[PDB]
Amino acid sequence: GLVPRGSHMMEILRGSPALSAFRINKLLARFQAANLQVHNIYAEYVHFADLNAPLNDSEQAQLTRLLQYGPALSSHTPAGKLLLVTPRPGTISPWSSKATDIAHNCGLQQVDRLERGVAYYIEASTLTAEQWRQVAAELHDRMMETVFSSLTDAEKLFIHHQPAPVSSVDLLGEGRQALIDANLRLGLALAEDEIDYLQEAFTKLGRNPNDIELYMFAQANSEHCRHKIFNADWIIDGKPQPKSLFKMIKNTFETTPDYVLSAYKDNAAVMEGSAVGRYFADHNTGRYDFHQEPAHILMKVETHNHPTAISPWPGAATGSGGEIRDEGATGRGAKPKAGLVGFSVSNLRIPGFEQPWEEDFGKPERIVTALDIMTEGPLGGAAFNNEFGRPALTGYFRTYEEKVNSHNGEELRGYHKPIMLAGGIGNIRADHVQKGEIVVGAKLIVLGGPAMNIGLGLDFASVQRDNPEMERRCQEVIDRCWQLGDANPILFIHDVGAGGLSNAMPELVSDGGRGGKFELRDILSDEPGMSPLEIWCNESQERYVLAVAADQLPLFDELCKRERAPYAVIGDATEEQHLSLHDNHFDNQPIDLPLDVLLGKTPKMTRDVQTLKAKGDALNRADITIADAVKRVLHLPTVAEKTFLVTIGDRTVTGMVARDQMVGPWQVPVADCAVTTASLDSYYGEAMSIGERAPVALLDFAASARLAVGEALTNIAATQIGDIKRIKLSANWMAAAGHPGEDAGLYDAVKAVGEELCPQLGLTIPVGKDSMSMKTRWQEGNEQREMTSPLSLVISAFARVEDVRHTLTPQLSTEDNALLLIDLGKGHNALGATALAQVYRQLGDKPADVRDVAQLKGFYDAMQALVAARKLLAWHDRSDGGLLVTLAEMAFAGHCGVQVDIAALGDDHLAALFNEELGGVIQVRAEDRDAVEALLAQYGLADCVHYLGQALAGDRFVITANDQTVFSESRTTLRVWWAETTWQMQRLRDNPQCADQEHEAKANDTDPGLNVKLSFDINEDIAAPYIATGARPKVAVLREQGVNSHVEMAAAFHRAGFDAIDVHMSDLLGGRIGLGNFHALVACGGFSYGDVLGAGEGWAKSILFNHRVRDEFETFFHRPQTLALGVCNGCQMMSNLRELIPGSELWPRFVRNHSDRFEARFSLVEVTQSPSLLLQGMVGSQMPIAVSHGEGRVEVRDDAHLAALESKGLVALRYVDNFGKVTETYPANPNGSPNGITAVTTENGRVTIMMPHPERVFRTVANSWHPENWGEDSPWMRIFRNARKQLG
């Protein structure tokens, strides 16, 4: 298929079937439910190639081959009515960016652009034109796609448009009205006093402003960018206040500067870390080595609330992506290392699973539902973290939507505009913390993606776009820069976010005390139609701005080319504090302004407001029983199991993850905080926790803020930190500013933490952000409706960790034990604004609060003493759902029972069980009870401490008060109820057979959990005699663009005695490396090309289609003694390279998981008998391994191929269930692979490929669960030692 398309030609190539049978059945069921008689539907991918020159036969065959990927679903002959769904004209999918990159890296420069659609063939002969429109509506996303009736209509996607010129606004010819008109036309949202300021500035300059100048100004002066509310003066109840909100936050730093290296002068804060071996490849040698130095710790938390209400996948994705850029742009360049995630939404109202507190109150047409946010949003956030490669290790998820009698009387309070929160930690070198100086003449660079018309102005302008692989490429350049140490050529770096370059470039010169002169036509653009305003102001993603000295440009160019990171020099820093943007195409100057004019401020805001305070109503208990309350509370999403948010996201990339959300042998997501190691050679590390309690703010603003700080501390407390001054906070404030009562409430809550609680505890808040229009208004029938959030403070706590090995979790032991409650509520047992109240549609009277500051500190210090002395068996703090939920979660994690007496906790059993006061349950050895009680007493806590009882083997969850049974249930029954939410979410989002299998396994109490059988001594270093010689063979640690798991791969080989060499595919292509110098090769994990065109396919085909590099690989694999390993993405790659690999004829392909979802699991495997030299000595072992993949499902051609592979004896690993049997049941087998197959070898055993990641778990400390008696080495270390010994 191939036709004229302007000065280019467009080719049409049919792809493979696009939807599996469950997805097809879902569509048919949706049509049936809407009364559309659709007899059948079939979907095929179709590819469009815009060509600038022709393809010869050989090139055409290459292109056709590149576009063969994906699971081998059965093709159907087209039949019925064609509906073709594509991206909207004027947009370029991320798919297109990455597929085009692959074509170019395969030598197809004739390809100008590849794009993809889905051709739907619908047989429904009896449908009206009206009903056809409804069909079309079901098949596409109106915010990013369109529907066409012919394949040839895809030509519209590639139309070339001539550059649009700059437009002036005619102030001199029309007066002020020109500015008023432009304000409305351009959507500038300017205030009257801003229009005054612009009017005078341009009158003084004696010329008309250009549209681009006004837009730039308007962006820079928004609430989003200027923080007017947080810098305002206040008057409250008639009294002027002494400090802004910002100054009150800064009070915490004035009080507690300890350990802080950077606060309030970058887009992340920095604190002291630990001296450890930072592991990376040297610039000159390419060898990975440990560099003993301080790894300091950066932190940042952001939000993306409004875009996520409009288009949740990209909203969440670019929420993560922007925050990752803030981290990498800290100082003079730094390295992200782990993420966190938060969602607050309205009620889910899951079809067929509606809960008794949920009422449908309507919503605006133009936003999505709470359910669609929680379906697509987490996938988007995860897509970014997975493809960029940072593990996502802690988070929160709250539902809230109720009609309540709050501060402004009876009104709807909720999250129709959601909280979408993304944050994280990173490491940074001491000499890079401070931004450098920008010398006059510095070159000013944009690093990253070509711009498009995104973010300007159905709300299309709020529809974002993410390409995480592009950002990984950029991160690698940043890494190379900071890895040069004193020769780091980055003088200054900053992320590109709101306002695009129009904010970022002025900010970067201005932060250096410089001006800039810029050339518009040097900026990389994928949309030649764009105006200067669009080019300068678009919010295209994956971009950074930086300054480099002119003499370092050749170095910078080398770094970028090797990573394949696009970059452009677009201007020069000037001594004069002026901003100039020239346009070589139109020979004119779109921007010509002094910086003081541009960056000049209208006056400060004054907010004159009054306090409103809600009168609580006592909880009406008419319909409440304890048993009913347990069942309801376990069904509140806020409380309920969070698996659907957890296993979708990588938790092992870097090899530094010590404590992830999933805990114990039954992998129950209840960990109270995240912990990473500082390096691959240390037990020092970092921790992250979150505290939040928004519904409390409907009753008491300051208490909600104090509880958020408190809960962050209780979540983190059983991790070995020491001095509380080591804990640093981000404070993210979400409010509906201007809503009656909220402004005074905001001030009071900031004051409560910044002026009071944080200084009194010794907690700094060195970073934070604010989002101040958290409400939603619409017309619902004949009436105005509004849904307003509670004031919503989210606190994230971050700390350097003294020993990651000493972290406690909620996993109860059944050795002889005591359960003790630390009730920091001091028996107040408040029920206001609890999960209990919410699930009966009420708010209640009085909420929890921090009852006693000294006791909170004493709790923290006492926990630190108990952790360091190793006196705790377990800890779980009390939060949503109260003591009942803390104890239940502990019993789920320990897969056991409890026998608990609550007679000491008051006569009100409901209140004792369901209050959400601060504190929690510690478990200690029985023999240590008296000593632990005495320790707690030393910290002033005796009256808060209560012996509850003990954990016991079995399935009974029993709560007594004297001789009365208060509540008694099967622990399994509770655990399954608690699972029903994630069950239902998985069920609607993923393959329902997998969701059901996962859920139903939880009901089998006989599940023994992950468990280990070892065929060898895991402590025996069989490589030691080799290492002792000092002779270290090289390993080629192979990476392609988008690979992310190479550093820990190198480290694993290093520990086994190799010299690990960084080999990029660019090194092979440029002659800098030749495989003939190596005896061992490893293809590493990640998302090369974002897996576009099938995971590992672009990587492999780039090798196959370059005859030189293809020959190199083939030569390597045909040598008699060479060894090769392919892990995950490398396994996929090597499976696509079979034709070069002897003995690989029976290998399968690796395709989309049967669940249709990314699976980040800690899975049980057995090592099976095969020739594999890398698994020698390990046959019959059974131990868990990190799994992190979406396309790991072994796929054979037919059963003859599966039988042949099996009979040849080439299977080397298989998934087993916890009973130890080979399985295809999910998630024990996470991807649906037949016969549990997840590793294969060649006939000679010299090449092994596997989907799981042994290199992520070679350290015991990095295994989510492991036997207590293991040393530093896990079983998986033996793979790398076997490689060493085999080389001799």
Ligand SMILES: Nc1ncnc2c1ncn2[C@@H]1O[C@H](COP(=O)(O)OP(=O)(O)O)[C@@H](O)[C@H]1O
């Ligand atoms: N949005 C999310 N993304 C990833 N993990 C999450 C998310 N929400 C919760 N989690 C994880 O699920 C577990 C249970 O969460 P939750 O019950 O909210 O924690 P807590 O009550 O201790 O504050 C924790 O390990 C938490 O980090």
Ligand SMILES: [Mg+2]
């Ligand atoms: Mg919880």
Ligand SMILES: [Mg+2]
């Ligand atoms: Mg907790």
Ligand SMILES: [Mg+2]
């Ligand atoms: Mg919480």
